[PDB]
Amino acid sequence: ATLKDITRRLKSIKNIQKITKSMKMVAAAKYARAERELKPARVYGVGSLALYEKADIKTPEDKKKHLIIGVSSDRGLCGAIHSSVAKQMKSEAANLAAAGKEVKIIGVGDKIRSILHRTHSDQFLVTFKEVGRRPPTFGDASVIALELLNSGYEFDEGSIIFNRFRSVISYKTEEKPIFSLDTISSAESMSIYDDIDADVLRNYQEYSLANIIYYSLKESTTSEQSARMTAMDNASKNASEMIDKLTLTFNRTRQAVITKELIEIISGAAAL
Amino acid sequence: VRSSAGAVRDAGGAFGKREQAEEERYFRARAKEQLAALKKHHENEIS
Amino acid sequence: DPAPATTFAHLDATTVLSRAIAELGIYPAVDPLDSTSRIMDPNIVGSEHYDVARGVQKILQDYKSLQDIIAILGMDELSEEDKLTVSRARKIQRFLSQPFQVAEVFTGHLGKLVPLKETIKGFQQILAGEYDHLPEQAFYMVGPIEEAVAKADKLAEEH
Amino acid sequence: DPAPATTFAHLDATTVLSRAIAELGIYPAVDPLDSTSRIMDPNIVGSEHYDVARGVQKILQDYKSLQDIIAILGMDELSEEDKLTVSRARKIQRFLSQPFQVAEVFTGHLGKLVPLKETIKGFQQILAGEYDHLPEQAFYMVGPIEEAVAKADKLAE
Amino acid sequence: VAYWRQAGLSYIRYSQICAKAVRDALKTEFKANAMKTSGSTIKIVKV
Amino acid sequence: QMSFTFASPTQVFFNSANVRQVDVPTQTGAFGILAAHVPTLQVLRPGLVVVHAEDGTTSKYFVSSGSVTVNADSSVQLLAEEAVTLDMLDLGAAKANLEKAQSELLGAADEATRAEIQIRIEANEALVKALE
Amino acid sequence: KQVAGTMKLELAQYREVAAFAQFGSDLDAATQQLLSRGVRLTELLKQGQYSPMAIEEQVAVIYAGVRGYLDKLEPSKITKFENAFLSHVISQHQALLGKIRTDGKISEESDAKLKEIVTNFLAGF
């Protein structure tokens, strides 16, 4: 090999390893901040769940509409995040298509738009953007939810896939269900609720749903940052590995060409 | 030794091929942007 | 090359081609941050021209540097200073080349007699960003920067 | 090597053996894209054999090529069709491999040769992915494609 | 309903305004923490 | 016992605590925390977290908005959009904000913008009232 | 030597994570400050052909950096800044310049005098 081209690859590799190291450090910062925030966020999200958790949530089985509540990031490099997301997404899509419930792919994050770029591309309800441009903002979550509220997609039910950061390593790629207050109409548990106006019940349902969005957002986002970090870590491992044999053969070829020219000169002297 | 700036791109392997292709994609996005803006500016100067 | 070694040994002026640039379609295609010439000096080129050329060299060096950086990430993370730098460097590369009239045999476009003041002016304008809303492809294989603005308008017509 | 370099123009079939394949545990470990001869043409090999050969060549081209990226990139950004074809070609390398009875003396797993037409048929089954869910491990050391399906069942077993 | 919701305006948007007011009542100590978690960037799919 | 989950989206006021009674202004309409308060939540209005706690504790935490929930398990889930600190603002600041909200409430553009200014009036009104 | 002892350590530390500068964003405050010191140095990193200067002048510039007295100078302009402060000294603190030079000993008072001359030159730059 051209020690020229070989060295080109080698320095490429060296730069690559350095870049991966820096990127992994950045991701470490990001996911560390993510975990730091997640503590109060964990409590808030637990509470947000507890609302509908407080009652047997049996929505209308006659839901002619469902909701494909999908959340992705504008950012990537978090491995199967978009991938496993689209996997559970396709699973639920087949399940809901079986139900014929008029679901619509609720979108935020171009990763899904890509997943949506073929998979029933028209099914996209609407794709909010910029997903992950900065740290999570439950205000921005509220904004997206407000766009949804503007949408008159009276989705009787829906589910939101979330990579529940079950650990730093474990991101439980689950889906978060959601009903409609209209479906919630006929509940004795609602009769077991204290004096709630229905649109007030509906508006509060919306508020809790937005809270759920923010919580799933923070959780999957921490999963994403940690995933990117660990991914960069594995990448750096593979990089050092490649560079190992690379440098091995590199010195091999270095001395090889050195002594090769040497022997050439030696023979040329012999020719003299 | 030393590592070049764009050392991989200098080498330009499959990584460098990706560099070129992503330059194509992003610069083409920006190019459609600039071209649309220019069409708008021409529309503005028409009146 | 040892032959290139002796060549550089006495070459009072350097004309470093970048055959990679030509492979990228450059026509001119020289090795920019590589060739040396004495008339490129603040005491010689003038402070303005030499300084501009050096800044161009720095900008292109950043272009190369961040090119691989993108190859890792891409213009998704393109920073404000960066995406700006990316576009500007692409434009500088574009404005670098020109198709000649003898080249118009193959290059089609006839030659553009580049004026020195016009060159420095296009350099300063690019430093400002004379085509921020426009496509750099007009600057490619072009003469004066104003001629490139005209070419971009022609593109606006042909779009 | 100048000796073999010159030797390359003398005999009909050039049999390149790839220790890299041996690293993949290939039995045998013949060079995938290197061992060659002018003995491949649909003018002789017909549409079936020559077409399958050219397609497998393209598949392996993609495979080895993407391997360079995957080197640290892994499948982490492998395109859906890309990843699909990649696992496919992995299973393909696995599948074309069959045991050797002479080797079975040491190996113990019976070796044999499938009919070339049988080879074309099983290769096509792979080409579509008739046993697309079957593993390269199952594909590994594969003679009869139906034997490969049975291997997949035993894998389920 | 609400002066908002009687007009039809969203108790959600009502809470949005409430947050705006809360920021308006951010302390000198708390003004930054209010700008903290102030951003938003999502933009829906348009054609 | 209560499950006093009083907490901002950012911070925590009560962490599933076990107190006696509590109230702050509510869009759903404020009332005291009673064990026989049915499993329910409320739409929040700007209040001060006033808890007749199980222990000798009445810690007033000014609240702005959000929603507070309480289950049959007394899951007092005061999820606060803005539970304002005791020192959360300056009385002069609230009065000037009220002045602006009234002038633009005088400058009420339209039932939408007027409703915005109306929320503003109610809000700075709660501001003065907490200051009151 | 005293100047270089900190200048080189800062240069290495900048170089220690200068790769991180690429992303730049979310720079750790210690890292960001180390970078700025390195960023300031990079501004000062250049050199002028056929342009020798007073060694004590460079010692003074590095000393001002050690004071952190350059922390607020935009690096693109920080170079012209240091140059202008240098001119201000070579006119005025040229007395203190020779004082340090012939002294070869960094009097804390002479150090402060140069520091103030530079502070005037720079705050007044």
Q: Which of A5, A9, A11 sits opposite B3 (nearest CB)?
A: A11
The C-alpha atoms of residue A50 and residue G89 are separated, in whole angstroms, by 70
The C-alpha atoms of residue A104 and residue A108 are separated, in whole angstroms, by 13
How is residue A135 written in tokens?
A: 């740290």
Domain holding E20, by residue range, is: 1-47
In contact, F99 and E24? CB cutoff 8 Å: no
**Ramachandran bin of C80, using left for φ above 0, alpha for ψ from -120 to 50, beta for the remaining angles:** alpha
For residue A2, the Cα-to-chain-centroid distance in whole angstroms is 42
Q: Please report the sign of the dihedral spanned by the C-alpha atoms of residue A246, residue A252, residue A258, residue A264.
A: negative
Helix (H, G, I), strand (E, B) or coil at F45: coil
How is residue D31 written in tokens?
A: 């060079």
Rounded to 10 degrees, the C-alpha dihedral D55/D58/D59/D65 comes to 170
In contact, G35 and G21? CB cutoff 8 Å: yes
Q: How many CB atoms lie within 10 A of CB G55?
A: 10
CA proximity to A80, closest of A202, A234, A223: A223
How is residue A222 written in tokens?
A: 């921490």
Domain holding A151, by residue range, is: 26-231
How is residue B33 written in tokens?
A: 């942007």
**Ramachandran bin of A119, using left for φ above 0, alpha for ψ from -120 to 50, beta for the remaining angles:** beta
The C-alpha atoms of residue F43 and residue F30 are separated, in whole angstroms, by 9
Helix (H, G, I), strand (E, B) or coil at F18: coil
Sheet (strand A157-164) strand order: A124-128, A105-108, A68-69, A157-164, A172-179
Which residues touch C158 (CB under 8 Å, ≥6 apart)? none
* Cβ-based contacts under 8 A for chains A and C: 13
Rounded to 10 degrees, the C-alpha dihedral A119/A120/A122/A125 comes to -80
Give the neighbours of chain E: at least 3 Cβ pairs within 8 Å. Answer: A, F
CATH number at residue D77: 1.10.1140.10
Output the CA–CA distances (angstroms, integers) from residue F61 to A42, E27, F40, in the order listed: 22, 15, 21
The residue of C76, C79, C83 whose CB has the most chain G CBs within 10 angstroms, and thus the best one to mutate to test that interface, is: C79
- One DSSP character per residue, F72-103 reads TT-EEEEEES-EE-TTSS-HHHHHHHHHHHHH
The C-alpha atoms of residue F12 and residue A6 are separated, in whole angstroms, by 58
Any alpha helices (H) in chain F, and if so which ranges?
91-106, 111-131
How is residue G24 written in tokens?
A: 């730049």
Residue A47: Cβ-neighbour burial (10 angstroms; 0-12, 13-18, 19+): buried
In contact, D151 and D138? CB cutoff 8 Å: yes
Helix (H, G, I), strand (E, B) or coil at A179: strand
Which long-range contacts does D38-47 make (Cβ < 8 Å, 24+ apart)? D38/D12, D39/D12, D39/D13
Helix (H, G, I), strand (E, B) or coil at A175: strand
CA proximity to F117, closest of F125, F105, F99: F105
> Pairing state of beta strands F3-7 and F12-17?
antiparallel
Map E1-47 to HEC letters: CCHHHHCCCCHHHHHHHHHHHHHHCCCCCCHHHHHCCCCCCCCCCCC
Measured in angstroms, the CA of B22 and the nearest CA of chain A are apart by 15
Map chain D to HEC letters: CHHHHHHCCCCCEECCECHHHHHCCCCCCECCCCCEECCCCHHHHHHHHHHHHHHHHHHHHHHHHHHHHHHHHCCCCCCHHHHHHHHHHHHHHHHHCCCCHHHHHHHCCCCCCCCHHHHHHHHHHHHHCCCCCCCHHHHCCCCCHHHHHHHHHHHHC
The C-alpha atoms of residue G50 and residue D85 are separated, in whole angstroms, by 63
How is residue F87 written in tokens?
A: 């020192």
For chain G, give every domain's residue range.
Answer: 1-125
Measured in angstroms, the CA of D101 and the nearest CA of chain B are apart by 41
Rounded to the nearest 5°, which phi and psi values hold at F30?
Answer: -70, 145
Which DSSP category does A170 fall into? -
CA proximity to D32, closest of D116, D103, D94, D125: D94
Buried b (16+ CB within 10 A) or exposed e, A71-100: bbbbbbbbbbbbbebbebbeebbeebeeee
Give the neighbours of chain B: at least 3 Cβ pairs within 8 Å. Answer: A, C, D
How is residue G107 written in tokens?
A: 């009097």
Distance separating the N- and C-terminal Cα atoms of chain G = 28
Residue A208 lies in a domain: yes
Nearest CA in chain C to B12: C68
Measured in angstroms, the CA of G102 and the nearest CA of chain C are apart by 34
Same domain for A227 and A262: no
Helix (H, G, I), strand (E, B) or coil at B47: coil
The C-alpha atoms of residue A27 and residue G22 are separated, in whole angstroms, by 14
Tell me the β-bridge partners of F77. Answer: F5, F69
Measured in angstroms, the CA of C81 and the nearest CA of chain B are apart by 15
Q: Which of B1, B2, B13 sits opposite A9 (nearest CB)?
A: B13
User: Which residues does G contribute to its contact with C (CB < 8 Å)?
Assistant: 22-25, 49
In contact, F34 and F47? CB cutoff 8 Å: no
Which technique was used to obtain these atomic coordinates? cryo-EM
The C-alpha atoms of residue A158 and residue A59 are separated, in whole angstroms, by 10
Which residues touch C75 (CB under 8 Å, ≥6 apart)? B22, B23, B26, B27, C83, C86
In contact, G59 and G97? CB cutoff 8 Å: no
* A26 contacts G22? CB cut-off 8 A: no
Output the CA–CA distances (angstroms, integers) from residue A58 to A48, A67, A82, in the order listed: 18, 16, 30
Map chain C to HEC letters: CHHHHHHHHHCCCCCCECHHHHHCCCCCCECCCCCCCCCCCCCCCHHHHHHHHHHHHHHHHHHHHHHHHHHHCCHHHCCHHHHHHHHHHHHHHHHHCCCCCCCHHHHCCCCCCCCHHHHHHHHHHHHHCCCCCCCHHHCCCCCCHHHHHHHHHHHHHHC
Residue F132 lies in a domain: no
Q: How many CB atoms lie within 10 A of CB A255?
A: 11
Buried b (16+ CB within 10 A) or exposed e, F23-32: bbbbbbeeee
Q: Please report the sign of the dihedral spanned by the C-alpha atoms of residue C98, residue C102, residue C104, residue C107.
A: negative
Cis peptide before D28 (omega within 30 of 0): yes
What total of structural domains would you count in chain F?
Answer: 2
Buried b (16+ CB within 10 A) or exposed e, C91-121: bbbbbbbbbbeebeeebebeebeeeeebbbe
Helix (H, G, I), strand (E, B) or coil at G105: coil
Sheet (strand F12-17) strand order: F12-17, F3-7, F75-80, F66-70, F40-43
Measured in angstroms, the CA of F88 and the nearest CA of chain E are apart by 5
Q: Which of A40, A51, A194 sits opposite F37 (nearest CB)?
A: A194
Same domain for F85 and F97: no
Residue F131 lies in a domain: no
CA proximity to C96, closest of C48, C57, C47, C66: C57
The C-alpha atoms of residue C29 and residue C107 are separated, in whole angstroms, by 14
Residue D29: Cβ-neighbour burial (10 angstroms; 0-12, 13-18, 19+): middle
Which residues touch B36 (CB under 8 Å, ≥6 apart)? none
Domain holding F110, by residue range, is: 90-126
CA proximity to C15, closest of C50, C42, C40: C40
* F38 contacts A195? CB cut-off 8 A: yes
The C-alpha atoms of residue A81 and residue F58 are separated, in whole angstroms, by 46
How is residue G119 written in tokens?
A: 């502070």
Angle CA F16–F19–F25, to nearest 5: 90
Helix (H, G, I), strand (E, B) or coil at F13: strand
- The yes-or-no reply on B/F contact (3 CB pairs or more, < 8 Å) is no
The C-alpha atoms of residue C85 and residue C62 are separated, in whole angstroms, by 8
How is residue C113 written in tokens?
A: 């007699």
Measured in angstroms, the CA of A15 and the nearest CA of chain E are apart by 33
The C-alpha atoms of residue C27 and residue C103 are separated, in whole angstroms, by 9
Q: Please report the sign of the dihedral spanned by the C-alpha atoms of residue F20, residue F21, residue F22, residue F26.
A: positive
The C-alpha atoms of residue D140 and residue D99 are separated, in whole angstroms, by 9
The C-alpha atoms of residue A178 and residue C69 are separated, in whole angstroms, by 42
Sheet (strand F61-63) strand order: F48-49, F61-63, F83-84
* D65 contacts B13? CB cut-off 8 A: no
Amino acid at G105: K
Helix (H, G, I), strand (E, B) or coil at A140: helix
Same domain for A31 and A17: no
Instruction: Tell whether residue G47 is among the known ligand binding residues.
Output: yes
CA proximity to A202, closest of E10, C142, C36, F64: E10
- Tokens 């199967």: give the residue: A80
The C-alpha atoms of residue F26 and residue F46 are separated, in whole angstroms, by 7
* C133 contacts B38? CB cut-off 8 A: yes
**Element housing G94 (H / E):** helix G94-103
Nearest CA in chain A to E20: A139
Amino acid at C43: N
CA Rg value for chain G: 15
The residue of F11, F79, F82 whose CB has the most chain E CBs within 10 angstroms, and thus the best one to mutate to test that interface, is: F82
Output the CA–CA distances (angstroms, integers) from residue A169 to A29, A111, F1, in the order listed: 16, 21, 37
CATH number at residue F84: 2.60.15.10
Distance separating the N- and C-terminal Cα atoms of chain E = 35
What total of structural domains would you count in chain A?
Answer: 2
Resolution of the entry in angstroms: 8.4
In contact, F64 and E18? CB cutoff 8 Å: yes
The C-alpha atoms of residue A81 and residue A167 are separated, in whole angstroms, by 15
Tell me the β-bridge partners of F50. Answer: F23
CA proximity to F47, closest of F69, F31, F70, F71: F31
Distance separating the N- and C-terminal Cα atoms of chain B = 61
> How many Cα atoms within 13 Å fall on the side-chain side of residue A86?
19
- The yes-or-no reply on G/B contact (3 CB pairs or more, < 8 Å) is no
Tell me the β-bridge partners of A128. Answer: A108
In contact, A175 and A162? CB cutoff 8 Å: yes
Domain holding C146, by residue range, is: 40-157
How is residue F128 written in tokens?
A: 């003065």
Q: How many CB atoms lie within 10 A of CB F105?
A: 20
Amino acid at D90: R
Q: Which of F39, F43, F66 sits opposite A54 (nearest CB)?
A: F39
Instruction: Tell whether residue G13 is among the known ligand binding residues.
Output: no
In contact, F64 and F81? CB cutoff 8 Å: yes
Same domain for F62 and F103: no
Helix (H, G, I), strand (E, B) or coil at A163: strand
The C-alpha atoms of residue G4 and residue G10 are separated, in whole angstroms, by 9
> Pairing state of beta strands A157-164 and A68-69?
parallel
CA proximity to A227, closest of A108, A82, A103: A82
CA Rg value for chain B: 18
Residue A272 lies in a domain: no
In contact, B41 and C155? CB cutoff 8 Å: no
Which DSSP category does G90 fall into? I
Helix (H, G, I), strand (E, B) or coil at A251: helix
Same domain for A254 and A192: no
How is residue G23 written in tokens?
A: 């992303």
The C-alpha atoms of residue D140 and residue D138 are separated, in whole angstroms, by 5
**Element housing B28 (H / E):** helix B14-46
In contact, F84 and F61? CB cutoff 8 Å: yes
CA proximity to A164, closest of A104, A84, A108: A84
> Pairing state of beta strands A105-108 and A68-69?
parallel
The C-alpha atoms of residue C92 and residue C127 are separated, in whole angstroms, by 9
Residue F11 lies in a domain: yes
Q: Is domain G1-125 classified as CATH 3.40.47.10?
A: no
How is residue A160 written in tokens?
A: 């939101």
**CB-based contact (8 Å) between C127 and chain G?**
no
Which residues touch G104 (CB under 8 Å, ≥6 apart)? none
* C68 contacts B10? CB cut-off 8 A: yes
The C-alpha atoms of residue E23 and residue E38 are separated, in whole angstroms, by 9
Same domain for A77 and A3: no
Distance separating the N- and C-terminal Cα atoms of chain A = 30
In contact, A128 and E42? CB cutoff 8 Å: yes
Residue F57 lies in a domain: yes
The C-alpha atoms of residue G103 and residue G96 are separated, in whole angstroms, by 10
**Element housing A244 (H / E):** helix A198-271
CA proximity to A205, closest of A69, A65, A59, A48: A48
Which DSSP category does F15 fall into? E
Tell me the β-bridge partners of A162. Answer: A174
